[PDB]
Structure 1
Amino acid sequence: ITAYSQQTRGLLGCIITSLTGRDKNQVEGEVQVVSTATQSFLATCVNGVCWTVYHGAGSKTLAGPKGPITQMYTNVDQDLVGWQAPPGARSLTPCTCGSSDLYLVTRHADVIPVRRRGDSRGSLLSPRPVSYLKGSSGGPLLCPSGHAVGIFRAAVCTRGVAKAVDFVPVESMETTMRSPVFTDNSSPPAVPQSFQVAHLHAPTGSGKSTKVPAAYAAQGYKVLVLNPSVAATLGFGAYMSKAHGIDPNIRTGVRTITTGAPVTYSTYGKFLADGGCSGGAYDIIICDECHSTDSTTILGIGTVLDQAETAGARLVVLATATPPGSVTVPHPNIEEVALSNTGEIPFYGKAIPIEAIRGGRHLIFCHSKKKCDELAAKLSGLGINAVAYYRGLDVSVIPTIGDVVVVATDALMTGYTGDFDSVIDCNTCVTQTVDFSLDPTFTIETTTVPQDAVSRSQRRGRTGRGRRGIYRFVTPGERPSGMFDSSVLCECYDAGCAWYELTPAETSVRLRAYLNTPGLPVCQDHLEFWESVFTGLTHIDAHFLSQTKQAGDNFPYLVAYQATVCARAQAPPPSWDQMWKCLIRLKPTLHGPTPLLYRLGAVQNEVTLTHPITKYIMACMSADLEVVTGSVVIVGRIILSS
């Protein structure tokens, strides 16, 4: 086997073709070079199906001869998507009597020898920089006779150097082919004789956590409904009294009510604080909004999946309206209008006409609190009754009745339950991302990114609830849904340690149950890595943890812990911004460089790497770390010949 590449499109063609969805050029080759606006990667045809990775393609259509081809297969768990190959497209054929000598074809048309080590793994005969494999996701692993064994999806790394590859095996594709593309998940399942995890995909208004738990209780079962929102959990208790004549148990941090009833509503956080499942307590457990990828929900759901069976439950329902891989569809009640540039109010490069928001109750989503304060002011500058809401502020600042423009972050989503006449959406969110930067250890960085379909649908769903609404937007873009960053795993161990008195080992068991359960949001498996680093964080200063807990910023454990190390070396923190405010009083005694454990923000002080905890975390970085490497458009091909 040998290979070379042929480019068939340039920038301009690729953008035009991506907008229209019409690709006229004939699909030749078996390995295609594909591209979205943000990324380029590979697609491989097998058994008449053009396959690639979910983390590159998302749920996007493939531009084709008669216009956009919508995906025939999507499996977020296998990181696999497929489109029916356009008429007259070659296919590699599956490899059955497989060799251990495989060849990986990259986007540079290189043919890299790989030695197979298991269903999904292969060692590179000669290790290479991970940068060299990027853009080759979705290309084939070939057995010696040129038949397909799988498609490449991730490199396995030691300190930035790829030594092994992870792939989606051909058999998994055949399983996905023989799976039903359409499955009915809209009705509540019947309670089985032995334990089952089941999925409920249904709009908000189906009664996922009002009607369906009502109905279960009527058949004699005890039901626990978990929700990420306090305001929503509290609110179910009133509604269920009015609407179904059940006064349920309510468990939040701010407020608990035990009536002895057969239905309990809890936060995930309060469920965690109470130590998880009581044996005997519940028959069914409904995990509502299980699309939610915040650390408390993930840890919470992970706890239910580890413990439920053994505490006597027979049914776990994983419930959401926006499951992984779902796409934003029209809402009959909601008119959608792109923002233009003619308007009095500037808003993320577009404009809001004052007429759109003068009078009425309206919600404008902003990515940051700084922008909420900004817009809430510029709107009082024009005589609108505006109010900012974000983490920290009390929800009471939002008037329950009367005109208002609420300028809010996603904190709104758990603080406040009401709806609005309209929603205006900046279409972006602030996210955290881990870089394995080895300078000295890892970095957690905050970025602004394009929203995904879950965020778009949750934001838009603040209007149109049983009455007509308007959704105005800055951009129609929408990144793939149902994935989250390894930094969310870090947060889970952080919270396990800071709040729920979980050991890292204990936290691993729960997260492992989450990862290994299909049909939930997905993430790189880095449990060992993160467990290993929290295990060495011993003897934290109780007093520092206390302040970082109460200040309520992110990574209270890792921050407090760095504080601890700095304070025991009478040394300053990475910097004097608010992150390290738990240390302001000790300032005048603190001198020299910072013994840096990791980077959670800008580091303005000089640093030393000689602290034994820094050396422990640096040793932790030698772990195997699996990293990944408008219509989708074919921009070239890789022609295959030994």
Structure 2
Amino acid sequence: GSVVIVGRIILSSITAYSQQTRGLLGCIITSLTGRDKNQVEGEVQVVSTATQSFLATCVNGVCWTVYHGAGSKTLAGPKGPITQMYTNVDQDLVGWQAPPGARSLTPCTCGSSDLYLVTRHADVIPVRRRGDSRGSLLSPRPVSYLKGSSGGPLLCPSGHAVGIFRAAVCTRGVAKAVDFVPVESMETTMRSPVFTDNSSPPAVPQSFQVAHLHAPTGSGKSTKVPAAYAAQGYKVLVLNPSVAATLGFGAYMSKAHGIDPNIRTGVRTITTGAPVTYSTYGKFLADGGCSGGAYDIIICDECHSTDSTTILGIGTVLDQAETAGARLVVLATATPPGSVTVPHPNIEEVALSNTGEIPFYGKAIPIEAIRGGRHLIFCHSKKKCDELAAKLSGLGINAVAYYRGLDVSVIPTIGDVVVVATDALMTGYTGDFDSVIDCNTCVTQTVDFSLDPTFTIETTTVPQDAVSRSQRRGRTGRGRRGIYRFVTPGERPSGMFDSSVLCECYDAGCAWYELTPAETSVRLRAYLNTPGLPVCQDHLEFWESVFTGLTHIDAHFLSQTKQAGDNFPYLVAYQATVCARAQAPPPSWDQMWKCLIRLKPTLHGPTPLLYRLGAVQNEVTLTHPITKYIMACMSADLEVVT
């Protein structure tokens, strides 16, 4: 899929109008071919993916738009797809060399405070400049009005570009201010080198440094490079999200490099006295982060990972490493933000068809492709894993399901098997497979500020991103020839995560790591202020404010939601506490509210509902002080992408 020009906003006293140039059929053919013979006119383009419509603004002979809209996509152009000239995920900025015909807006220099936002509807909105990247809407407007206007210009009165619109600053669903990428950020990006080589590890600097290591899985990132640093006389800590990978680095280093390292996981610790320690982010956070003086180098491996333990773990590194006497933090990944899945020499890629014995996500699997050999099938849910493995078992194929809750001993280490797994496989099991078959979808959590009364955590099935695709396919072609079969060919942009992940960090801080919400903010700020990492809307102040109010949890409910292993154990147990103490029933009797079953005959009346973590069957009361408190928290400025 390419980005497609589907129309234009013509600019002039600043007045505007829109001209559509493409319908649906055209847009979708042009996205697929990447070839657009249509003539480019004007400085503001109305642009489109298959999922989303937005704006693109030409300044300085570059067509700019937002990374959250365009990802790392090509622009359809005359002689074919144009690859992006600039990709800045930290600034939320992309750019393509401006197609022939397109005029540019000149940057604004003569610092005006009267700004005008051009929208997709061709409206010209007064905006008073505040900060470098902020302007206040003179007439506050509902956020929905500003949707699809991302990438549109903010103009000073002379009609010169101050920057491009990227986000609305919300009070209870009403946009009061706008967040824009400034023209100065574009200039910086135009001056930065297009390809920067981060394939080799840095030499340990004299003063503290954060370096980036972009090199494939098993290129040495986590074995050869800690070994080589130790050989120079350094103490190295290597952090990995996976227990199985941390434990497995231990035997690989004893054989390949003659170091018996320290190993640190929840399940198993080995202290040898060695200058190399492998630990998971979790066990590191459990141990209370950086040990003063213990390490010269910290290597944060798989730093594209956007689970809450990793982000909190990395943000702890970034806030504590220099004071603890470290000289080097290496953020290490094969899939940095902005990365795209490209052909692999060892991996033959084959689309699923409709012909085959085994139904799979609307397509089919031939029995021949998986009868014999060791194969991995990725499913989105545990229910799909059980159904598929039961089918395969009846069909006489030796088949096994793996997901969260299951012990990894379900997987045979040798002989024929089809493993039917969720992404839990990434942290439980280290092995590779003759083929990988991928559903190309995953379960994700999103926050919705639904004001009904407060917020909602939603569970949705979404298409995979570039990180998911590459990590799934990377289970084959590992020093062997591999096959990769897929339902769908596409991938979402990589290096972005949802605000519910922030909430999850605060939850885990409170539930597991005995971290105050204030301490969680410090660690997360460190993560957010470090470029080259995945990006999130800055909702640290809001999330801090709601967890701050969650005082005096029942330790027995918290223990129980912790033991049960499910998400948001702190939020779940804090709802249960409010219910038990209000002598009131839970939102429903789902397995989530298990901890309240011994109180089921005594709890009557409306639920003191705090927030929505699933379906609410019972009648609700909005009268609880905690509810009133989380409702006040909703008045916070929330930056939301438009």
Give the corresponding residue for 1:174: 187
3-state SS of paired residue (1:152): strand
Query: For each residue in 1:481-509, what CA deviation from the matched residue of structure 2 results, as whole angstroms up to 9, or x when unmatched?
Result: 00000000000000000000000000000
Deviation of 1:589 (Å)? 1.2
Give the corresponding residue for 1:443: 456
Give the corresponding residue for 1:509: 522
Rounded Cα–Cα distance in structure 2 between residues aligned with 1:351 and 1:29: 47
Rounded Cα–Cα distance in structure 1 between residues aligned with 2:111 and 2:374: 64
Rounded Cα–Cα distance in structure 1 between residues aligned with 2:26 and 2:484: 32
Query: For each residue in 1:389-421, what CA deviation from the matched residue of structure 2 results, as whole angstroms up to 9, or x when unmatched?
Result: 000000000001110000000000000000000
Deviation of 1:98 (Å)? 2.0
Match of 1:548 among 535, 551, 561: 561
Does 1:27 pair with 2:40? Answer: yes
Between 287-296 and 84-93, the greater mean CA deviation after superposition: 84-93
3-state SS of paired residue (1:540): coil
3-state SS of paired residue (2:111): coil
Query: For each residue in 1:20-58, what CA deviation from the matched residue of structure 2 results, as whole angstroms up to 9, or x when unmatched?
Result: 001111100100000000000000000000000000000
Rounded Cα–Cα distance in structure 2 between residues aligned with 1:550 and 1:425: 31
3-state SS of paired residue (1:311): coil
Rounded Cα–Cα distance in structure 2 between residues aligned with 1:98 and 1:76: 26
Deviation of 1:439 (Å)? 0.3
Give the corresponding residue for 2:284: 271
Give the corresponding residue for 1:43: 56
Give the corresponding residue for 2:293: 280
Please list every run of 5 or more consecutive structure 1 residues that lacks an aligned counterpart in the other structure. Answer: 630-642
Rounded Cα–Cα distance in structure 1 between residues aligned with 2:601 and 2:431: 48
Rounded Cα–Cα distance in structure 1 between residues aligned with 2:102 and 2:630: 50
Query: For each residue in 1:511-531, what CA deviation from the matched residue of structure 2 results, as whole angstroms up to 9, or x when unmatched?
Result: 000000000000000000000
Rounded Cα–Cα distance in structure 2 between residues aligned with 1:385 and 1:581: 35
Rounded Cα–Cα distance in structure 1 between residues aligned with 2:298 and 2:234: 10
Rounded Cα–Cα distance in structure 1 between residues aligned with 2:489 and 2:177: 38
Match of 1:589 among 586, 597, 602: 602
Query: For each residue in 1:232-274, what CA deviation from the matched residue of structure 2 results, as whole angstroms up to 9, or x when unmatched?
Result: 0000000000000000000000000000000000000000000
Rounded Cα–Cα distance in structure 2 between residues aligned with 1:590 and 1:415: 40
Deviation of 1:540 (Å)? 0.2
Query: For each residue in 1:256-296, what CA deviation from the matched residue of structure 2 results, as whole angstroms up to 9, or x when unmatched?
Result: 00000000000000000000001110000000000000000
Deviation of 1:85 (Å)? 0.7
- Count of matched residue positions in the alignment of Structure 1 and Structure 2: 629
Rounded Cα–Cα distance in structure 1 between residues aligned with 2:527 and 2:610: 29
Deviation of 1:206 (Å)? 1.2
Deviation of 1:571 (Å)? 1.1
CA RMSD of aligned residues (A): 0.5
3-state SS of paired residue (2:490): coil
Deviation of 1:88 (Å)? 2.3
Deviation of 1:378 (Å)? 1.1
Deviation of 1:59 (Å)? 0.4
Q: Percent identity?
A: 100
3-state SS of paired residue (1:17): helix
Deviation of 1:205 (Å)? 2.1
3-state SS of paired residue (1:505): helix
Rounded Cα–Cα distance in structure 1 between residues aligned with 2:621 and 2:207: 57
Deviation of 1:580 (Å)? 0.9
Query: For each residue in 1:135-182, what CA deviation from the matched residue of structure 2 results, as whole angstroms up to 9, or x when unmatched?
Result: 000000000001001000000000000000000000100100000010
Match of 1:92 among 91, 105, 113: 105
Deviation of 1:585 (Å)? 1.9
Deviation of 1:214 (Å)? 0.2
Deviation of 1:381 (Å)? 1.9
Deviation of 1:372 (Å)? 0.3
Deviation of 1:562 (Å)? 0.2
Rounded Cα–Cα distance in structure 2 between residues aligned with 1:502 and 1:205: 34
Give the corresponding residue for 1:639: none
3-state SS of paired residue (2:147): coil
3-state SS of paired residue (1:310): coil
Query: For each residue in 1:188-212, what CA deviation from the matched residue of structure 2 results, as whole angstroms up to 9, or x when unmatched?
Result: 0000000000000000121001000
Give the corresponding residue for 2:244: 231
Give the corresponding residue for 2:3: none
Deviation of 1:592 (Å)? 0.7
Query: For each residue in 1:409-456, what CA deviation from the matched residue of structure 2 results, as whole angstroms up to 9, or x when unmatched?
Result: 000000000000000000001000000000000000000001000000
Between 418-427 and 571-580, the greater mean CA deviation after superposition: 571-580
Rounded Cα–Cα distance in structure 1 between residues aligned with 2:110 and 2:133: 16
Give the corresponding residue for 1:58: 71
Give the corresponding residue for 1:633: none
TM-score norm. by structure 2 comes to 0.98
TM-score norm. by structure 1 comes to 0.98
Give the corresponding residue for 1:420: 433
Rounded Cα–Cα distance in structure 1 between residues aligned with 2:179 and 2:394: 56
Rounded Cα–Cα distance in structure 2 between residues aligned with 1:125 and 1:41: 23
Rounded Cα–Cα distance in structure 1 between residues aligned with 2:421 and 2:219: 27
Match of 2:390 among 366, 377, 380: 377
Rounded Cα–Cα distance in structure 2 between residues aligned with 1:354 and 1:585: 49
Rounded Cα–Cα distance in structure 2 between residues aligned with 1:264 and 1:336: 37
Correspondence list, 1:367-406, <5 A: 367-406=380-419
Deviation of 1:569 (Å)? 1.6
Give the corresponding residue for 1:199: 212
Rounded Cα–Cα distance in structure 1 between residues aligned with 2:609 and 2:256: 56
Between 176-185 and 89-98, the greater mean CA deviation after superposition: 89-98
Deviation of 1:555 (Å)? 0.1
Query: For each residue in 1:556-587, what CA deviation from the matched residue of structure 2 results, as whole angstroms up to 9, or x when unmatched?
Result: 00000000011112211001111111211221
Rounded Cα–Cα distance in structure 2 between residues aligned with 1:400 and 1:570: 51
Rounded Cα–Cα distance in structure 2 between residues aligned with 1:279 and 1:252: 20
Give the corresponding residue for 1:250: 263
Give the corresponding residue for 2:538: 525
Rounded Cα–Cα distance in structure 2 between residues aligned with 1:82 and 1:126: 31
Select the structure with the greater relative contact order (CA < 8 A; seq sep ≥ 6): 1
Correspondence list, 1:339-378, <5 A: 339-378=352-391
Does 1:487 pair with 2:494? Answer: no
3-state SS of paired residue (1:176): helix
Please list every run of 5 or more consecutive structure 2 residues that lacks an aligned counterpart in the other structure. Answer: 1-13
Rounded Cα–Cα distance in structure 2 between residues aligned with 1:420 and 1:610: 56
Rounded Cα–Cα distance in structure 1 between residues aligned with 2:291 and 2:394: 55
Query: For each residue in 1:586-639, what CA deviation from the matched residue of structure 2 results, as whole angstroms up to 9, or x when unmatched?
Result: 21111111000000000000100000000000000000000000xxxxxxxxxx
Rounded Cα–Cα distance in structure 1 between residues aligned with 2:114 and 2:595: 56
Rounded Cα–Cα distance in structure 2 between residues aligned with 1:463 and 1:588: 53
Query: For each residue in 1:73-104, what CA deviation from the matched residue of structure 2 results, as whole angstroms up to 9, or x when unmatched?
Result: 00000000000011221001111112000000
Rounded Cα–Cα distance in structure 1 between residues aligned with 2:309 and 2:563: 16
Query: For each residue in 1:290-336, what CA deviation from the matched residue of structure 2 results, as whole angstroms up to 9, or x when unmatched?
Result: 00000000000000000000000000000000000000000000000
Give the corresponding residue for 2:511: 498
Rounded Cα–Cα distance in structure 2 between residues aligned with 1:279 and 1:217: 19
Rounded Cα–Cα distance in structure 1 between residues aligned with 2:102 and 2:587: 57
Query: For each residue in 1:517-554, what CA deviation from the matched residue of structure 2 results, as whole angstroms up to 9, or x when unmatched?
Result: 00000000000000000000000000000000010000
Rounded Cα–Cα distance in structure 2 between residues aligned with 1:170 and 1:596: 45
Rounded Cα–Cα distance in structure 1 between residues aligned with 2:55 and 2:442: 28
Give the corresponding residue for 2:311: 298
Correspondence list, 1:429-440, <5 A: 429-440=442-453
Rounded Cα–Cα distance in structure 2 between residues aligned with 1:86 and 1:614: 53
Deviation of 1:341 (Å)? 0.1
Off by >4 Å, runs of 4+ in structure 1: none
Give the corresponding residue for 2:81: 68
Rounded Cα–Cα distance in structure 1 between residues aligned with 2:44 and 2:394: 58
